[PDB]
Copies of this chain bind each other. A is one copy, B any other.
């Protein structure tokens, strides 16, 4: 499935941090849109797991839905 998240990133270092935690999770194909504060993740991992992984960063995260 393909999920979209809102993630409050401000600089390219913020985007790098999201990339690093998602790399560490594994089993994801992701695309980070820094100026629109959006992260799109294609994964077999549950929405819960993706959301928990993103919130681990200490950034503000919410769910923009499927597809």
Contacts and interface: CB of A to CB of B under 8 A. Distances in A.
Contacts of A16: 58
Q: A-side binding surface: helix, strand, loop or mixed?
A: helix
Given A57-B56, A57-B57, A13 B9 contact: yes
A56 B25 CA distance: 11
Nearest to A20: B58
A19 B52 CA distance: 17
A10 B8 contact: no
Interface in A7-22: 8-14, 16-21
Question: Which of A21, A58, A59: most chain B Cβ within 10 A?
Answer: A58
A42 B43 CA distance: 39
